[PDB]
PDB file of C-alpha atoms and ligand atoms in Angstrom:
ATOM      1  CA  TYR F   1     237.139 149.505  34.446  1.00  0.00           C
ATOM      2  CA  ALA F   2     235.757 147.837  37.567  1.00  0.00           C
ATOM      3  CA  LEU F   3     232.034 147.727  38.327  1.00  0.00           C
ATOM      4  CA  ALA F   4     230.666 149.241  41.526  1.00  0.00           C
ATOM      5  CA  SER F   5     230.044 146.926  44.472  1.00  0.00           C
ATOM      6  CA  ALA F   6     227.677 146.972  47.433  1.00  0.00           C
ATOM      7  CA  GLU F   7     226.521 145.181  50.563  1.00  0.00           C
ATOM      8  CA  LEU F   8     222.832 144.829  51.339  1.00  0.00           C
ATOM      9  CA  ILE F   9     222.341 145.902  54.982  1.00  0.00           C
ATOM     10  CA  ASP F  10     218.790 146.068  56.398  1.00  0.00           C
ATOM     11  CA  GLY F  11     217.102 146.998  53.149  1.00  0.00           C
ATOM     12  CA  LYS F  12     219.873 149.435  52.190  1.00  0.00           C
ATOM     13  CA  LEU F  13     222.491 148.977  49.465  1.00  0.00           C
ATOM     14  CA  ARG F  14     225.752 150.344  50.898  1.00  0.00           C
ATOM     15  CA  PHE F  15     228.179 150.884  48.068  1.00  0.00           C
ATOM     16  CA  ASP F  16     231.879 150.752  48.689  1.00  0.00           C
ATOM     17  CA  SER F  17     232.421 154.100  46.918  1.00  0.00           C
ATOM     18  CA  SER F  18     230.495 157.356  47.200  1.00  0.00           C
ATOM     19  CA  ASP F  19     229.532 157.154  43.506  1.00  0.00           C
ATOM     20  CA  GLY F  20     228.642 153.462  43.575  1.00  0.00           C
ATOM     21  CA  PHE F  21     224.896 153.605  42.964  1.00  0.00           C
ATOM     22  CA  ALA F  22     225.279 156.327  40.323  1.00  0.00           C
ATOM     23  CA  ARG F  23     227.747 154.091  38.464  1.00  0.00           C
ATOM     24  CA  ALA F  24     225.527 151.014  38.905  1.00  0.00           C
ATOM     25  CA  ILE F  25     222.512 152.557  37.179  1.00  0.00           C
ATOM     26  CA  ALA F  26     224.698 153.964  34.397  1.00  0.00           C
ATOM     27  CA  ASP F  27     226.609 150.690  33.903  1.00  0.00           C
ATOM     28  CA  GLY F  28     223.514 148.482  34.217  1.00  0.00           C
ATOM     29  CA  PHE F  29     225.644 146.012  36.246  1.00  0.00           C
ATOM     30  CA  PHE F  30     227.161 145.891  39.739  1.00  0.00           C
ATOM     31  CA  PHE F  31     228.371 143.471  42.409  1.00  0.00           C
ATOM     32  CA  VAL F  32     226.542 142.658  45.640  1.00  0.00           C
ATOM     33  CA  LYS F  33     227.959 140.672  48.530  1.00  0.00           C
ATOM     34  CA  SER F  34     226.214 137.357  49.020  1.00  0.00           C
ATOM     35  CA  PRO F  35     224.490 136.909  52.391  1.00  0.00           C
ATOM     36  CA  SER F  36     224.774 133.552  54.125  1.00  0.00           C
ATOM     37  CA  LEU F  37     223.521 131.633  51.089  1.00  0.00           C
ATOM     38  CA  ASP F  38     224.438 127.999  50.505  1.00  0.00           C
ATOM     39  CA  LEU F  39     224.985 127.515  46.770  1.00  0.00           C
ATOM     40  CA  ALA F  40     225.815 123.784  46.787  1.00  0.00           C
ATOM     41  CA  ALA F  41     222.470 122.549  45.431  1.00  0.00           C
ATOM     42  CA  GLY F  42     222.445 125.005  42.542  1.00  0.00           C
ATOM     43  CA  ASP F  43     226.059 124.186  41.721  1.00  0.00           C
ATOM     44  CA  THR F  44     225.163 120.478  41.692  1.00  0.00           C
ATOM     45  CA  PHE F  45     222.208 121.096  39.396  1.00  0.00           C
ATOM     46  CA  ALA F  46     224.396 123.240  37.119  1.00  0.00           C
ATOM     47  CA  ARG F  47     226.876 120.354  36.714  1.00  0.00           C
ATOM     48  CA  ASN F  48     224.269 117.597  36.312  1.00  0.00           C
ATOM     49  CA  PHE F  49     220.906 118.637  34.878  1.00  0.00           C
ATOM     50  CA  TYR F  50     221.842 117.848  31.267  1.00  0.00           C
ATOM     51  CA  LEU F  51     223.332 114.447  32.050  1.00  0.00           C
ATOM     52  CA  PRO F  52     221.322 111.259  31.583  1.00  0.00           C
ATOM     53  CA  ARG F  53     219.890 110.161  34.901  1.00  0.00           C
ATOM     54  CA  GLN F  54     221.680 107.105  36.277  1.00  0.00           C
ATOM     55  CA  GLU F  55     221.291 105.416  39.636  1.00  0.00           C
ATOM     56  CA  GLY F  56     223.350 107.035  42.376  1.00  0.00           C
ATOM     57  CA  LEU F  57     223.883 110.160  44.447  1.00  0.00           C
ATOM     58  CA  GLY F  58     223.588 112.495  41.463  1.00  0.00           C
ATOM     59  CA  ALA F  59     220.326 111.041  40.114  1.00  0.00           C
ATOM     60  CA  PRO F  60     217.870 113.662  41.523  1.00  0.00           C
ATOM     61  CA  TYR F  61     219.928 116.396  39.822  1.00  0.00           C
ATOM     62  CA  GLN F  62     220.130 114.578  36.451  1.00  0.00           C
ATOM     63  CA  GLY F  63     217.861 113.807  33.523  1.00  0.00           C
ATOM     64  CA  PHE F  64     216.116 117.151  33.308  1.00  0.00           C
ATOM     65  CA  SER F  65     215.934 117.061  29.515  1.00  0.00           C
ATOM     66  CA  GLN F  66     212.683 115.196  30.259  1.00  0.00           C
ATOM     67  CA  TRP F  67     211.144 118.401  31.668  1.00  0.00           C
ATOM     68  CA  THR F  68     209.900 120.208  28.563  1.00  0.00           C
ATOM     69  CA  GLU F  69     207.258 122.829  27.808  1.00  0.00           C
ATOM     70  CA  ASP F  70     204.473 120.255  27.394  1.00  0.00           C
ATOM     71  CA  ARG F  71     204.930 119.118  31.022  1.00  0.00           C
ATOM     72  CA  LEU F  72     205.247 122.665  32.385  1.00  0.00           C
ATOM     73  CA  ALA F  73     204.312 125.778  30.395  1.00  0.00           C
ATOM     74  CA  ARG F  74     205.574 127.700  27.397  1.00  0.00           C
ATOM     75  CA  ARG F  75     209.177 128.956  27.777  1.00  0.00           C
ATOM     76  CA  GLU F  76     209.755 126.579  30.728  1.00  0.00           C
ATOM     77  CA  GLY F  77     212.109 123.647  31.131  1.00  0.00           C
ATOM     78  CA  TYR F  78     214.942 122.275  29.018  1.00  0.00           C
ATOM     79  CA  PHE F  79     216.260 123.860  25.801  1.00  0.00           C
ATOM     80  CA  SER F  80     219.178 122.952  23.549  1.00  0.00           C
ATOM     81  CA  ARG F  81     220.211 125.870  21.344  1.00  0.00           C
ATOM     82  CA  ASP F  82     221.233 125.522  17.696  1.00  0.00           C
ATOM     83  CA  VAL F  83     223.595 128.506  17.329  1.00  0.00           C
ATOM     84  CA  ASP F  84     224.550 129.191  20.950  1.00  0.00           C
ATOM     85  CA  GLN F  85     226.712 126.974  23.117  1.00  0.00           C
ATOM     86  CA  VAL F  86     224.235 127.027  26.013  1.00  0.00           C
ATOM     87  CA  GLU F  87     221.847 124.272  26.813  1.00  0.00           C
ATOM     88  CA  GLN F  88     219.516 125.658  29.428  1.00  0.00           C
ATOM     89  CA  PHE F  89     216.979 124.913  32.125  1.00  0.00           C
ATOM     90  CA  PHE F  90     214.383 127.604  32.915  1.00  0.00           C
ATOM     91  CA  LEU F  91     212.018 127.177  35.827  1.00  0.00           C
ATOM     92  CA  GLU F  92     209.461 129.642  37.161  1.00  0.00           C
ATOM     93  CA  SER F  93     208.678 129.620  40.882  1.00  0.00           C
ATOM     94  CA  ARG F  94     205.264 127.952  40.647  1.00  0.00           C
ATOM     95  CA  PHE F  95     206.987 124.763  39.409  1.00  0.00           C
ATOM     96  CA  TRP F  96     209.913 124.705  41.862  1.00  0.00           C
ATOM     97  CA  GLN F  97     208.300 122.445  44.455  1.00  0.00           C
ATOM     98  CA  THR F  98     207.233 119.846  41.869  1.00  0.00           C
ATOM     99  CA  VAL F  99     210.430 119.774  39.801  1.00  0.00           C
ATOM    100  CA  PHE F 100     213.468 120.757  41.940  1.00  0.00           C
ATOM    101  CA  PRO F 101     214.974 118.549  44.669  1.00  0.00           C
ATOM    102  CA  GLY F 102     214.293 119.873  48.158  1.00  0.00           C
ATOM    103  CA  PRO F 103     217.683 121.526  48.692  1.00  0.00           C
ATOM    104  CA  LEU F 104     217.457 123.308  45.347  1.00  0.00           C
ATOM    105  CA  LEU F 105     213.906 124.459  46.094  1.00  0.00           C
ATOM    106  CA  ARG F 106     215.195 125.998  49.320  1.00  0.00           C
ATOM    107  CA  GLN F 107     218.158 127.633  47.590  1.00  0.00           C
ATOM    108  CA  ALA F 108     215.831 129.015  44.911  1.00  0.00           C
ATOM    109  CA  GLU F 109     213.522 130.468  47.566  1.00  0.00           C
ATOM    110  CA  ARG F 110     216.448 132.095  49.366  1.00  0.00           C
ATOM    111  CA  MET F 111     217.774 133.580  46.116  1.00  0.00           C
ATOM    112  CA  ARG F 112     214.269 134.875  45.316  1.00  0.00           C
ATOM    113  CA  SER F 113     213.968 136.563  48.715  1.00  0.00           C
ATOM    114  CA  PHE F 114     217.408 138.130  48.361  1.00  0.00           C
ATOM    115  CA  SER F 115     216.681 139.308  44.809  1.00  0.00           C
ATOM    116  CA  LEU F 116     213.507 141.084  45.908  1.00  0.00           C
ATOM    117  CA  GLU F 117     215.387 142.692  48.800  1.00  0.00           C
ATOM    118  CA  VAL F 118     217.906 143.969  46.244  1.00  0.00           C
ATOM    119  CA  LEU F 119     215.076 145.274  44.039  1.00  0.00           C
ATOM    120  CA  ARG F 120     213.422 147.130  46.928  1.00  0.00           C
ATOM    121  CA  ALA F 121     216.791 148.641  47.901  1.00  0.00           C
ATOM    122  CA  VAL F 122     217.299 149.860  44.322  1.00  0.00           C
ATOM    123  CA  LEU F 123     213.803 151.362  44.061  1.00  0.00           C
ATOM    124  CA  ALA F 124     214.403 153.132  47.386  1.00  0.00           C
ATOM    125  CA  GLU F 125     217.246 155.083  45.763  1.00  0.00           C
ATOM    126  CA  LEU F 126     215.237 156.176  42.677  1.00  0.00           C
ATOM    127  CA  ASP F 127     212.708 158.972  42.192  1.00  0.00           C
ATOM    128  CA  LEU F 128     209.800 156.504  42.191  1.00  0.00           C
ATOM    129  CA  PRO F 129     207.178 156.914  44.920  1.00  0.00           C
ATOM    130  CA  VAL F 130     206.492 153.852  47.086  1.00  0.00           C
ATOM    131  CA  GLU F 131     202.728 154.058  46.461  1.00  0.00           C
ATOM    132  CA  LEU F 132     203.414 153.030  42.847  1.00  0.00           C
ATOM    133  CA  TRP F 133     205.998 150.266  43.453  1.00  0.00           C
ATOM    134  CA  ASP F 134     203.717 147.207  43.510  1.00  0.00           C
ATOM    135  CA  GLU F 135     201.882 148.039  40.279  1.00  0.00           C
ATOM    136  CA  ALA F 136     204.891 149.633  38.576  1.00  0.00           C
ATOM    137  CA  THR F 137     206.982 146.483  38.951  1.00  0.00           C
ATOM    138  CA  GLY F 138     204.355 144.006  37.780  1.00  0.00           C
ATOM    139  CA  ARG F 139     203.223 142.783  41.219  1.00  0.00           C
ATOM    140  CA  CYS F 140     206.535 140.985  41.725  1.00  0.00           C
ATOM    141  CA  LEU F 141     206.946 142.660  45.136  1.00  0.00           C
ATOM    142  CA  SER F 142     203.689 141.096  46.407  1.00  0.00           C
ATOM    143  CA  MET F 143     204.914 137.637  45.279  1.00  0.00           C
ATOM    144  CA  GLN F 144     202.691 137.441  42.184  1.00  0.00           C
ATOM    145  CA  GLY F 145     205.539 138.039  39.752  1.00  0.00           C
ATOM    146  CA  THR F 146     207.588 135.811  37.477  1.00  0.00           C
ATOM    147  CA  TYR F 147     210.677 134.414  39.218  1.00  0.00           C
ATOM    148  CA  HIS F 148     212.959 132.112  37.246  1.00  0.00           C
ATOM    149  CA  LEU F 149     215.913 130.138  38.456  1.00  0.00           C
ATOM    150  CA  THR F 150     217.577 129.551  35.084  1.00  0.00           C
ATOM    151  CA  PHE F 151     220.706 127.507  34.349  1.00  0.00           C
ATOM    152  CA  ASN F 152     223.233 127.835  31.504  1.00  0.00           C
ATOM    153  CA  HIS F 153     225.542 124.943  30.588  1.00  0.00           C
ATOM    154  CA  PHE F 154     228.060 126.121  27.964  1.00  0.00           C
ATOM    155  CA  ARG F 155     228.701 123.130  25.689  1.00  0.00           C
ATOM    156  CA  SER F 156     232.317 123.620  24.646  1.00  0.00           C
ATOM    157  CA  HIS F 157     231.894 121.001  21.903  1.00  0.00           C
ATOM    158  CA  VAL F 158     229.525 123.399  20.076  1.00  0.00           C
ATOM    159  CA  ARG F 159     231.348 125.791  17.737  1.00  0.00           C
ATOM    160  CA  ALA F 160     229.270 128.912  18.343  1.00  0.00           C
ATOM    161  CA  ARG F 161     229.087 132.057  20.428  1.00  0.00           C
ATOM    162  CA  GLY F 162     228.646 131.188  24.103  1.00  0.00           C
ATOM    163  CA  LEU F 163     225.466 133.203  24.608  1.00  0.00           C
ATOM    164  CA  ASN F 164     224.193 135.820  22.161  1.00  0.00           C
ATOM    165  CA  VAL F 165     224.067 139.557  22.803  1.00  0.00           C
ATOM    166  CA  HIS F 166     220.902 140.314  24.780  1.00  0.00           C
ATOM    167  CA  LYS F 167     219.271 142.378  27.464  1.00  0.00           C
ATOM    168  CA  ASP F 168     217.526 140.543  30.279  1.00  0.00           C
ATOM    169  CA  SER F 169     213.768 141.046  30.204  1.00  0.00           C
ATOM    170  CA  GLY F 170     212.970 142.126  33.734  1.00  0.00           C
ATOM    171  CA  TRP F 171     213.755 144.074  36.910  1.00  0.00           C
ATOM    172  CA  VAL F 172     216.911 142.643  38.475  1.00  0.00           C
ATOM    173  CA  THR F 173     218.904 139.490  37.739  1.00  0.00           C
ATOM    174  CA  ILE F 174     221.073 137.970  40.505  1.00  0.00           C
ATOM    175  CA  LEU F 175     223.793 136.002  38.674  1.00  0.00           C
ATOM    176  CA  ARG F 176     225.877 133.114  40.087  1.00  0.00           C
ATOM    177  CA  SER F 177     229.030 132.448  38.071  1.00  0.00           C
ATOM    178  CA  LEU F 178     232.642 131.389  38.589  1.00  0.00           C
ATOM    179  CA  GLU F 179     234.572 131.984  35.357  1.00  0.00           C
ATOM    180  CA  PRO F 180     235.365 134.715  32.810  1.00  0.00           C
ATOM    181  CA  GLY F 181     233.234 134.986  29.701  1.00  0.00           C
ATOM    182  CA  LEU F 182     230.646 137.655  30.450  1.00  0.00           C
ATOM    183  CA  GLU F 183     231.138 140.902  28.539  1.00  0.00           C
ATOM    184  CA  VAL F 184     228.922 143.977  28.947  1.00  0.00           C
ATOM    185  CA  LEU F 185     228.513 146.881  26.548  1.00  0.00           C
ATOM    186  CA  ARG F 186     229.866 150.085  28.088  1.00  0.00           C
ATOM    187  CA  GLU F 187     230.461 153.315  26.158  1.00  0.00           C
ATOM    188  CA  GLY F 188     230.231 151.379  22.894  1.00  0.00           C
ATOM    189  CA  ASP F 189     232.919 148.834  23.815  1.00  0.00           C
ATOM    190  CA  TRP F 190     232.689 145.314  25.222  1.00  0.00           C
ATOM    191  CA  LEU F 191     233.957 145.181  28.818  1.00  0.00           C
ATOM    192  CA  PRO F 192     234.959 141.770  30.230  1.00  0.00           C
ATOM    193  CA  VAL F 193     233.497 141.138  33.690  1.00  0.00           C
ATOM    194  CA  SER F 194     234.895 138.434  35.961  1.00  0.00           C
ATOM    195  CA  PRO F 195     232.924 137.152  38.956  1.00  0.00           C
ATOM    196  CA  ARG F 196     234.156 137.731  42.494  1.00  0.00           C
ATOM    197  CA  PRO F 197     234.041 135.027  45.198  1.00  0.00           C
ATOM    198  CA  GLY F 198     231.358 135.636  47.794  1.00  0.00           C
ATOM    199  CA  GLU F 199     229.585 138.109  45.490  1.00  0.00           C
ATOM    200  CA  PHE F 200     226.809 137.985  42.924  1.00  0.00           C
ATOM    201  CA  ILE F 201     226.617 140.006  39.741  1.00  0.00           C
ATOM    202  CA  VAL F 202     223.413 142.074  39.592  1.00  0.00           C
ATOM    203  CA  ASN F 203     222.032 143.621  36.440  1.00  0.00           C
ATOM    204  CA  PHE F 204     218.925 145.471  35.342  1.00  0.00           C
ATOM    205  CA  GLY F 205     216.576 144.281  32.628  1.00  0.00           C
ATOM    206  CA  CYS F 206     214.352 145.905  30.016  1.00  0.00           C
ATOM    207  CA  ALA F 207     211.398 146.394  32.370  1.00  0.00           C
ATOM    208  CA  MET F 208     213.572 148.515  34.664  1.00  0.00           C
ATOM    209  CA  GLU F 209     214.842 150.612  31.757  1.00  0.00           C
ATOM    210  CA  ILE F 210     211.337 151.154  30.333  1.00  0.00           C
ATOM    211  CA  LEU F 211     209.864 152.098  33.719  1.00  0.00           C
ATOM    212  CA  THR F 212     212.487 154.730  34.530  1.00  0.00           C
ATOM    213  CA  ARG F 213     213.362 156.133  31.077  1.00  0.00           C
ATOM    214  CA  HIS F 214     211.277 159.317  31.368  1.00  0.00           C
ATOM    215  CA  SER F 215     211.621 159.734  35.152  1.00  0.00           C
ATOM    216  CA  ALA F 216     214.062 161.995  36.978  1.00  0.00           C
ATOM    217  CA  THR F 217     216.363 158.981  37.595  1.00  0.00           C
ATOM    218  CA  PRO F 218     216.637 156.761  34.504  1.00  0.00           C
ATOM    219  CA  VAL F 219     218.249 153.343  34.950  1.00  0.00           C
ATOM    220  CA  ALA F 220     220.100 151.536  32.159  1.00  0.00           C
ATOM    221  CA  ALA F 221     219.592 147.967  31.041  1.00  0.00           C
ATOM    222  CA  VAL F 222     222.653 147.064  29.014  1.00  0.00           C
ATOM    223  CA  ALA F 223     223.432 144.506  26.351  1.00  0.00           C
ATOM    224  CA  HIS F 224     225.709 141.658  27.382  1.00  0.00           C
ATOM    225  CA  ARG F 225     227.009 138.381  25.961  1.00  0.00           C
ATOM    226  CA  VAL F 226     229.171 135.361  26.796  1.00  0.00           C
ATOM    227  CA  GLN F 227     232.242 134.564  24.713  1.00  0.00           C
ATOM    228  CA  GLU F 228     232.546 131.189  22.999  1.00  0.00           C
ATOM    229  CA  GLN F 229     234.111 128.675  25.408  1.00  0.00           C
ATOM    230  CA  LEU F 230     236.840 126.366  24.107  1.00  0.00           C
ATOM    231  CA  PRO F 231     237.316 122.746  25.283  1.00  0.00           C
ATOM    232  CA  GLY F 232     239.487 121.971  28.279  1.00  0.00           C
ATOM    233  CA  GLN F 233     238.557 121.131  31.894  1.00  0.00           C
ATOM    234  CA  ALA F 234     235.075 121.742  33.299  1.00  0.00           C
ATOM    235  CA  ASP F 235     232.510 123.358  31.023  1.00  0.00           C
ATOM    236  CA  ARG F 236     231.485 126.837  32.091  1.00  0.00           C
ATOM    237  CA  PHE F 237     228.123 127.186  33.809  1.00  0.00           C
ATOM    238  CA  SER F 238     226.095 130.027  35.233  1.00  0.00           C
ATOM    239  CA  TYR F 239     222.686 130.386  36.769  1.00  0.00           C
ATOM    240  CA  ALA F 240     220.625 133.294  37.929  1.00  0.00           C
ATOM    241  CA  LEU F 241     217.472 134.405  39.702  1.00  0.00           C
ATOM    242  CA  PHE F 242     215.536 136.528  37.176  1.00  0.00           C
ATOM    243  CA  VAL F 243     212.822 138.823  38.586  1.00  0.00           C
ATOM    244  CA  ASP F 244     210.068 139.703  36.094  1.00  0.00           C
ATOM    245  CA  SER F 245     206.556 141.114  36.126  1.00  0.00           C
ATOM    246  CA  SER F 246     203.592 138.777  36.389  1.00  0.00           C
ATOM    247  CA  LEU F 247     202.655 137.112  33.104  1.00  0.00           C
ATOM    248  CA  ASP F 248     198.961 136.865  34.067  1.00  0.00           C
ATOM    249  CA  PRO F 249     197.306 139.736  32.141  1.00  0.00           C
ATOM    250  CA  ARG F 250     194.602 140.256  34.769  1.00  0.00           C
ATOM    251  CA  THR F 251     197.276 140.660  37.449  1.00  0.00           C
ATOM    252  CA  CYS F 252     199.717 142.771  35.410  1.00  0.00           C
ATOM    253  CA  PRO F 253     198.633 144.357  32.102  1.00  0.00           C
ATOM    254  CA  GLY F 254     202.195 144.833  30.810  1.00  0.00           C
ATOM    255  CA  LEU F 255     205.221 147.102  31.115  1.00  0.00           C
ATOM    256  CA  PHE F 256     204.692 150.628  32.466  1.00  0.00           C
ATOM    257  CA  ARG F 257     206.593 153.873  32.177  1.00  0.00           C
ATOM    258  CA  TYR F 258     206.460 156.348  35.072  1.00  0.00           C
ATOM    259  CA  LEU F 259     205.782 159.954  34.058  1.00  0.00           C
ATOM    260  CA  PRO F 260     206.353 162.177  37.113  1.00  0.00           C
ATOM    261  CA  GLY F 261     203.306 164.287  37.900  1.00  0.00           C
ATOM    262  CA  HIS F 262     201.062 162.057  35.767  1.00  0.00           C
ATOM    263  CA  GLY F 263     201.540 158.441  36.845  1.00  0.00           C
ATOM    264  CA  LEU F 264     202.037 155.045  35.249  1.00  0.00           C
ATOM    265  CA  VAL F 265     201.495 154.752  31.493  1.00  0.00           C
ATOM    266  CA  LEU F 266     201.053 151.240  30.105  1.00  0.00           C
ATOM    267  CA  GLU F 267     203.631 151.077  27.326  1.00  0.00           C
ATOM    268  CA  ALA F 268     203.954 147.484  26.147  1.00  0.00           C
ATOM    269  CA  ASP F 269     202.304 144.076  26.276  1.00  0.00           C
ATOM    270  CA  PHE F 270     204.789 142.136  28.405  1.00  0.00           C
ATOM    271  CA  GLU F 271     204.184 138.618  27.091  1.00  0.00           C
ATOM    272  CA  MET F 272     204.480 139.869  23.507  1.00  0.00           C
ATOM    273  CA  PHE F 273     207.660 141.750  24.435  1.00  0.00           C
ATOM    274  CA  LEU F 274     209.126 138.685  26.139  1.00  0.00           C
ATOM    275  CA  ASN F 275     208.235 136.240  23.352  1.00  0.00           C
ATOM    276  CA  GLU F 276     209.919 138.513  20.793  1.00  0.00           C
ATOM    277  CA  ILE F 277     213.130 139.223  22.709  1.00  0.00           C
ATOM    278  CA  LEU F 278     213.497 135.555  23.704  1.00  0.00           C
ATOM    279  CA  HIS F 279     213.123 134.333  20.134  1.00  0.00           C
ATOM    280  CA  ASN F 280     215.538 136.950  18.803  1.00  0.00           C
ATOM    281  CA  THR F 281     218.163 135.944  21.369  1.00  0.00           C
ATOM    282  CA  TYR F 282     218.643 132.470  19.870  1.00  0.00           C
ATOM    283  CA  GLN F 283     218.541 133.011  16.083  1.00  0.00           C
ATOM    284  CA  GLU F 284     221.673 133.235  13.973  1.00  0.00           C
ATOM    285  CA  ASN F 285     221.428 136.826  12.700  1.00  0.00           C
ATOM    286  CA  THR F 286     219.337 138.571  15.380  1.00  0.00           C
ATOM    287  CA  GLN F 287     220.092 139.789  18.912  1.00  0.00           C
ATOM    288  CA  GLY F 288     218.068 139.895  22.118  1.00  0.00           C
ATOM    289  CA  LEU F 289     217.498 143.655  22.035  1.00  0.00           C
ATOM    290  CA  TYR F 290     214.436 145.863  21.675  1.00  0.00           C
ATOM    291  CA  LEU F 291     213.522 149.082  19.886  1.00  0.00           C
ATOM    292  CA  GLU F 292     212.553 151.935  22.225  1.00  0.00           C
ATOM    293  CA  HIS F 293     209.063 153.310  21.556  1.00  0.00           C
ATOM    294  CA  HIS F 294     207.902 156.911  20.925  1.00  0.00           C
TER     295      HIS F 294
HETATM  296  C1  LIG R   1     211.439 135.552  31.728  1.00  0.00           C
HETATM  297  C2  LIG R   1     212.613 134.567  31.615  1.00  0.00           C
HETATM  298  C3  LIG R   1     212.877 134.163  30.170  1.00  0.00           C
HETATM  299  C4  LIG R   1     211.663 133.478  29.519  1.00  0.00           C
HETATM  300  O1  LIG R   1     211.301 132.320  30.209  1.00  0.00           O
HETATM  301  C5  LIG R   1     213.862 135.215  32.227  1.00  0.00           C
HETATM  302  N1  LIG R   1     214.219 136.466  31.554  1.00  0.00           N
HETATM  303  C6  LIG R   1     215.464 136.646  30.788  1.00  0.00           C
HETATM  304  O2  LIG R   1     215.720 137.697  30.280  1.00  0.00           O
HETATM  305  C7  LIG R   1     216.471 135.513  30.634  1.00  0.00           C
HETATM  306  C8  LIG R   1     216.403 134.994  29.191  1.00  0.00           C
HETATM  307  C9  LIG R   1     217.766 134.657  28.560  1.00  0.00           C
HETATM  308  C10 LIG R   1     218.653 135.890  28.442  1.00  0.00           C
HETATM  309  C11 LIG R   1     218.498 133.574  29.347  1.00  0.00           C
HETATM  310  O3  LIG R   1     217.523 134.171  27.273  1.00  0.00           O
HETATM  311  N2  LIG R   1     216.218 134.390  31.542  1.00  0.00           N
HETATM  312  C12 LIG R   1     214.993 134.204  32.290  1.00  0.00           C
HETATM  313  O4  LIG R   1     214.868 133.251  33.010  1.00  0.00           O
HETATM  314  O1  AKG R   2     226.787 133.316  31.967  1.00  0.00           O
HETATM  315  C1  AKG R   2     226.853 134.543  32.222  1.00  0.00           C
HETATM  316  O2  AKG R   2     227.856 135.062  32.782  1.00  0.00           O
HETATM  317  C2  AKG R   2     225.721 135.460  31.796  1.00  0.00           C
HETATM  318  C3  AKG R   2     224.375 134.737  31.632  1.00  0.00           C
HETATM  319  C4  AKG R   2     223.250 135.670  31.198  1.00  0.00           C
HETATM  320  O3  AKG R   2     223.440 136.815  30.816  1.00  0.00           O
HETATM  321  C5  AKG R   2     221.879 135.189  31.227  1.00  0.00           C
HETATM  322  O4  AKG R   2     221.653 133.990  31.508  1.00  0.00           O
HETATM  323  O5  AKG R   2     220.962 136.006  30.964  1.00  0.00           O
HETATM  324 FE1   FE R   3     221.629 137.937  30.676  1.00  0.00          FE
END
């Protein structure tokens, strides 16, 4: 099975098959053509952030193990996992200017703009009235949301799963990758997904699934994982722009569900939801999934 694919053209997702969008929201995953988007700075960071900083050209992209939660905020910065191959760097948008080199800041901003264009184009196809969009998606459309550029370095010397089964937490994720390894759950079976040059992989997160579950057009967020990587040639990396609701509780009170004819119902505390699913992603015998309520 091949995922649907689209081009973003003036706020409109044009899929390359008549059933493309229908398949995308059933599959939880689809491809989108990259606009003119230089990826060199992110690729450099993805190959260097975990290395010790040494004098030279690579130095500004190295040594980021020094950026931990105490210098940023909870859930931010560098993490080495015990029972996953990934070592990771998470960074929310409010820290990008302080922490990222200039070229990576600019790439992050361009990926953020593109990701929100993708989100608006998806919402435009759903039975969700525009007057509710800003509140319903956690104020991320008015630039008060939670935007991470997050990097995965798959340490092939670690004998463990590559990245545990999980759902992403938020609205859309725009994923930059080069190699096989991603598998998505489809009709009860694990489907390998390979990246495509000049394209990003897009997927929906839990917030999208919760918002639309009881609407006329429900959208799936689907479980996915990365296979254990074995040694030999460059380590696998990936990185992605994750779009999430605001984490400030006076800006966004949590995750909503839309009930047509009634309005938005506040279903879940988002920070609690996020803290739980994040922790469960990286333990030995749990998974990054959630139990649907009601
Ligand atoms: C909100 C933020 C996570 C918390 O900081 C964001 N959401 C996600 O779902 C993933 C988490 C992952 C699957 C990599 O564990 N990545 C992110 O950057
Ligand atoms: O590395 C990949 O292909 C997937 C990464 C992923 O799912 C994530 O970071 O949430
Ligand atoms: Fe993911």
